[PDB]
Symmetry: C2
Subunit: 141 residues, 2 copies
């Protein structure tokens, strides 16, 4: 509104949560997920998981675009770990992404990781958080 970057986006969506901790979150017209506290064993997802799903997907999409700009097939994969830390009124999330590119030498995988770190929208939102790290790996084993 004040921020005129909202005036004509490429795409917009919305998400709602209007339930108790043991509840659901949903995209109106779209995906609904069961949610629950990460501190119990009940079925359901949580913000930590949902954030990891968001970032891993965004990084992977960005990596696919980079691969294509280099004339390469898609052989990349991303794993994101999210940690919940702290105490009442002092809670934080930590986020650590791992990027692999199976098709290529490690130096190329590292270069692509640097490229995607700079381009991925979710990565950019977390850049200044103090809580986000990213690395290149050869596998997730």
């Amino acid at each position: 509104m004040q921020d005129e970057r909202w005036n004509h986006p490429l795409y917009t969506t919305t998400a709602i949560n209007d339930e108790e901790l043991e509840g659901h979150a949903y995209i109106p017209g779209g995906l609904k997920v069961q949610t629950s506290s990460p501190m119990n064993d009940h079925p359901g997802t949580n913000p930590e998981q949902l954030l990891g799903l968001s970032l891993s997907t965004c990084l992977e999409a960005t990596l696919e675009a980079v691969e294509k700009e280099h004339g390469l097939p898609h052989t990349g994969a991303v794993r994101v770990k999210v940690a919940f830390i702290g105490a009442r009124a002092e809670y934080q999330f930590l986020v650590h992404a791992q990027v692999m590119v199976k098709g290529v030498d490690f130096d190329t995988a590292k270069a692509f990781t640097n490229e995607i770190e700079n381009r991925c929208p979710v990565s950019k939102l977390l850049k200044n958080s103090g809580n986000y790290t990213i690395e290149t790996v050869t596998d997730f084993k």
Copy 2:
């Protein structure tokens, strides 16, 4: 070596190892179909997943704040996410809207301020320059 990773409350991991028309998953947990937001194919996307994460986190934080004030849980949170930009210049914008049906607007605003400061996903986004939050009385428009 960030020591905050040493003994967390909870950790999880998310993977995306597929094409844009693919899936993301939590090992042993939720798997979601994904797709580009720029087509009409089935599947979620990073924008949606981020909205689900933040709306859920804000709502959970709000539930704690309501309880601290001895009020029932009447809150609801909607998060809008926009995709803007161009090749190698893409960003997301995030706008949270918080309602607390059981209380007057000044109280709803006060609670919104409290959750903005406590919600882990909100804190991650604080320094992004792309995240705003407001108090509302409904989700019109």
